[PDB]
Subunit: 118 residues, 4 copies
Amino acid sequence: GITGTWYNQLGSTFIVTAGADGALTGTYESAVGNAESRYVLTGRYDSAPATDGSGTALGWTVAWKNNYRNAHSATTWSGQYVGGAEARINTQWLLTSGTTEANAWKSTLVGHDTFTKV
Amino acid sequence: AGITGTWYNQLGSTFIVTAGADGALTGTYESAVGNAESRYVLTGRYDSAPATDGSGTALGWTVAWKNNYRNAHSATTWSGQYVGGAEARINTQWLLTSGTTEANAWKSTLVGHDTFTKVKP
Amino acid sequence: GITGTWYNQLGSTFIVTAGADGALTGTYESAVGNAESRYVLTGRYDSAPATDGSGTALGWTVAWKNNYRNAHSATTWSGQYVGGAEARINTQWLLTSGTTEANAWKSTLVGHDTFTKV
Amino acid sequence: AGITGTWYNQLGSTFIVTAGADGALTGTYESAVGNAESRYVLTGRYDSAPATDGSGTALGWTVAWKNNYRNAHSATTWSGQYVGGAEARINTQWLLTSGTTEANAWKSTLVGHDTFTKVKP
Ligand SMILES: O=C(O)CCC[C@@H]1SC[C@@H]2NC(=O)N[C@@H]21
Ligand SMILES: O=C(O)CCC[C@@H]1SC[C@@H]2NC(=O)N[C@@H]21
Ligand SMILES: O=C(O)CCC[C@@H]1SC[C@@H]2NC(=O)N[C@@H]21
Ligand SMILES: O=C(O)CCC[C@@H]1SC[C@@H]2NC(=O)N[C@@H]21
């Protein structure tokens, strides 16, 4: 279910492969920010979720550096997968930028992305 | 190189990591607190080409709390930066999400911050 | 514009009064959690926003204690007001619970609420 | 009572506050960093009836960065707890939102954490 191509409210493209062992692998393409084309991503997820109606926790990282640019920063998405007729992945993220110790106080942005397969 | 090694945070948790030349991070994490025991696999990414100034190196990693002994049905992601030198440090802020029913979703995510100190290998 | 009765995706009721000086005052009633009836709230907002198309930053707090219960915790909402045909207040919150120093690591929840007048 | 007084965080910022018996917090804040100068009004709320155990006192306050000298078109909210005793502390986590256009909304909110130390009044 998790495996596939997903899109968030901003129009970004998330392409993941979920291994049976609990690994997440794929590429991420952002529709906004100091970025172009695809970026490697790696993460983990609960490969044995609860039997009740709970979602399956997951999380991945993306360092914003590839062959075209280096924004000198990383983003981590933490959230949960909810299956069904209209599957979705609701997350919250932390975008940290490399900074001098003097600007460390304003180095981390926080947001929330919702991904669907549409 | 700098990032690679054994680190510990203020909680007494252990962070063993290796930085690949492609910007990949792999290793194991051991939490001193929470519903967890033994080692859990971790995977992340970092800026393999930081600015040559006094800036830190942005990085991040995830850890799904499930191994061959326990499953907490949750995942934590650490987002922060590495700061080298004599006293190398990794200052991070994290998000720990628990799997929940639709009704309890609003209280599924905890937020915190850990500071890691590296041990002379 | 900010003044009025708002509702979030959870069904909670937010009733605010925005003073000309930049003060926020009102009551908050949550549809979920260890809470019942109304709770006092106080906050601040930019009473002189930018002339471009920017939203107006705002933020308020609610200690979860009233005549009926005391959940021993506080919530702060930080976000921005966007006027127009369909006004809304998009926010992100931090819910801190009073805890022993040993549980301090898991004392703060983080989320995001969207309020509309519907 | 405990909370009331002058406090400072690791950045060198000043936090003057008074705790009302109704659970209200009022005072002024002075930031050591950012687009700010002089004092800004603050308002918050706290648990005026904490648990008699070793628990902390939950509290929170907002500060819109606008006074008679500057307007940064932003607001910060601090959420945390007070911990009394010999060395009283206020450990918090904050959210600073900037007013932005619809297009830049995604990068409107910064997240951090401040620790406040009280000064013997
Ligand atoms: O400036 C950069 O480094 C690019 C930031 C991209 C960010 S990550 C969180 C948000 N979600 C998304 O799909 N794109 C933006
Ligand atoms: O899932 C659980 O119950 C274990 C949570 C462990 C958490 S992750 C953030 C925090 N840092 C750490 O070293 N340990 C705790
Ligand atoms: O258990 C409690 O203290 C009540 C928590 C209520 C929380 S505040 C963030 C979320 N938004 C809302 O409208 N209700 C919930
Ligand atoms: O709006 C601005 O540019 C000023 C931001 C000041 C921020 S609020 C969180 C942080 N703590 C503090 O004492 N100062 C900074």
